[PDB]
DNA sequence: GCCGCCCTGGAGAATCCCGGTGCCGAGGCCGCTCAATTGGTCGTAGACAGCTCTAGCAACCGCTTAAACGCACGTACGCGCTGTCCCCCGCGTTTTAACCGCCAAGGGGATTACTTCCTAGTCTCCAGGCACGTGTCAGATATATACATCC
């Protein structure tokens, strides 16, 4: 019900359904966020949008 | 004497069934309407008969000879088993475009009716192209006869 949202960890999850969604979120968000943070070819407009 | 708790009865509301009435799919009925029917006439397609000549057919012959058949051997290939690895399938997740519903105007094309004229059918006459047969002629082929030569 979006009120029982839990702050979890990979070892705290174990093996449940939807772990591929967690892997996809981790890969996309973390990899692309640190890519746009660490790239020197990033303007101020891109980082603020 | 006063106050709180457990047991049981009749009235108010929800649901199933039936009857009256309105709406969707299909069939009977009516009206147009054009194509099938009927009746008559005539030309000709085809049936029938007749004669001639050639191919086929049943059953036999005889001869030749090459193909078919039988047999032995051998070995190459079909097939079965095993390994392996790789690639396709199943599944979960994310994207994306098919699908449906919308403009906005305009052209293409299917009908209905009408006009016109060019071109193809039809008829008559004629002539030349096609089919068949034959005389003749030049190229190809085989041998007759004369000259140089080896033993």
Experimental technique used to determine this entry: cryo-EM
Residue A8 near residue A2 (C-beta atoms within 8 A): no
C-alpha–C-alpha distance, residues A12 and A19, integer Å: 12
A23 closest-nt by C1' vs CA: B93
DSSP state of A2: -
A17 closest-nt by C1' vs CA: B92
DSSP state of A15: S
In angstroms, this model's resolution equals 2.6
Nucleotides of B under 7 A from a protein CB: 92-94
C-alpha–C-alpha distance, residues A49 and A47, integer Å: 6
């Amino acid at each position: 019900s979006h009120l029982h949202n839990t702050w979890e960890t990979y070892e705290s999850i174990g093996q449940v359904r939807g772990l591929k969604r967690l892997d996809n979120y981790c890969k996309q968000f973390i990899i692309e966020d640190q890519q746009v943070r660490l790239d020197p070819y990033v303007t101020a407009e891109d980082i603020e949008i």
